[PDB]
Amino acid sequence: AYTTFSATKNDQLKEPMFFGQPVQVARYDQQKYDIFEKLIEKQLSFFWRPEEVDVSRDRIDYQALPEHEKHIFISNLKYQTLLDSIQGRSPNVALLPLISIPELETWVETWAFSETIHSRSYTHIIRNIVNDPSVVFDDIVTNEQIQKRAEGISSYYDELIEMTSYWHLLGEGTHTVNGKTVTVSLRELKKKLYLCLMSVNALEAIRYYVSFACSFAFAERELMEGNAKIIRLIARDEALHLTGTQHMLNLLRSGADDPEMAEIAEECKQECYDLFVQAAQQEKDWADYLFRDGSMIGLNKDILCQYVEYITNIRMQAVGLDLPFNTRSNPIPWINTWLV
Template identity: 30%
Template sequence: MNETMNELKIKPIFNPNGDDSLINRRIINGSTTNLFNLNEIKYTWAKSLYRVMLANFWIPEKVDLSQDTLDYQNLNEHEKKAFESILSFLTFLDSIQTNNIPNIANYITAPEVRTLLAIQEYQEVIHSQSYAYILESIIPIERRNKVYELWRTDDILFDRNKYIAGIYQDFINSSSNTNFARVMVANYILESLYFYNGFIFFYNLATKHVMLGTADEIRYINRDELTHIDLFVKVIKTINQENDNFITQELVHEMFAIAAQQEIEWTNYILGNNIAGMDTKSTEKYTKYLVNQRIVNIGFEPLYPGYNENPYQSFELMSDNSGESVKSNFFESTVTNYSQATAIEGWDEI
């Protein structure tokens, strides 16, 4: 971490002497009044991202899962175990993310960026609701609570959740500059790396024409997550511009290396070589490829030279052509098409 940044300050909720001028506005350590004057925006990317995030609104129950309930009976034991374990992990991630976003938001002094974190928070709740809907529809009641409890009873899952949640907790305990840098990178890792081998498992099932409803739910979640990645890319890069490269490549490499190792270990543990279409080699290739992409996106050198190819390119194509309403480029941190909600340009159109 670069030591030149001023000590991080939590923002007051009532700050009548604050300075909302664009020239003095900062992502952190500014002096905002907290007023949402959204006609005066410094970070113009926030405005377009806001529109994209709103346009992505979706309702989990609109996806029909009745065929998935039947398909589930025909999954083999490895697929059932993977299905439940991945859902358990994703449920934990979205739960903790919902709870952690406000901790970061307390330090964000750009109103236009704060609004995006509010939308992100509610989207993470929708994701949790979608997992509940999937579990309720597909998993027999006697197994359902086991899925929810797996994060406490499975040692490997427990350890990796402890790593990310521990960093979140450290920031609550002490909002030092070091802990802030770590919590920002941890958030970025959660959003940009942790979900993705799990997502691929569902797309892989969909290529076999089973669990298609679940895959559609995942595609909606995936579309939201891409905007969250985009948000954290922008925030991290801007914080670095405004604070003399406060978040360093050294820290990013150190944390991503640990996260990648855990992601590979976990994926091998639940999928191994037991699922047709995915194996330990492709898991390693994909995870390291993603890590490189994510690190380059925030302006640093890749961690794993040579891992430039996505072994799951075919799943990207599959995930794009089975529905007209969810279309996005899953492996880039930019969303390319949003067609679910209609933008309303003026009051007279309502």
């Protein structure tokens, strides 16, 4: 069913965002949704290369850090490297085979490309501060706690990729594959896309924002400046990445794009709620790992689930869900000097 150039002259302004006919000519002169084209212009305007940032003094600062603080810093860096490794390849292998309008196709490619610049940033920081990089890169894959926090991210992507493969190969219906019946259903595939997309939104909206806080706390003490300059540039990109996912989900939820997608949003409302609360909870549980050997000036586990509670509430009402946490002002207003 998938093709890299569908031979049908079709009207790309009238196609749904997903599961319509595959894009053939990449046009940018008109668009169903201007927002995706604007996010492409803005992300190209923000292009930056990690190597321009001097992180040489960070090697000295990290070495002087009080051990539990070296742990807080590198543990958070290791989790940041894991997320951007998944965000470099996955928008592309998971969403590109389903997009039917060109501007969202080129936005998903600009977004995945700015994710690999973030992964390149983390090699630039690690190699500069730790002298045997292999010690931190190999601990990403097997570290129990990084896997508990990231639990569930690969799963959503992988199930969507697998389901997409059945759909494109076999189409809808009940089929037999070696004695087993396999039912392919487009409604199910749309719920899977929807939940996947709400999970990417929770990843960029919440999961990165908790790590920015740990990086900028060091920056407030004039430590790890350098790492902070890079995390600032990354934070500016993520504001756009998050704008993109919020627009995609509000458009699907509003019924403006595919009527059936709005039905699915409403039916899936409780599972979205619980899934956001589980993402927040994983961040909280993580704070226990991070601050087990003691806290640092400006940040501890108490100020952190507070901040995760605050940021989850902001992101959840943005995508029209109900707030799970009791309303707060921002517990760490100093962070806005580094973010927005």
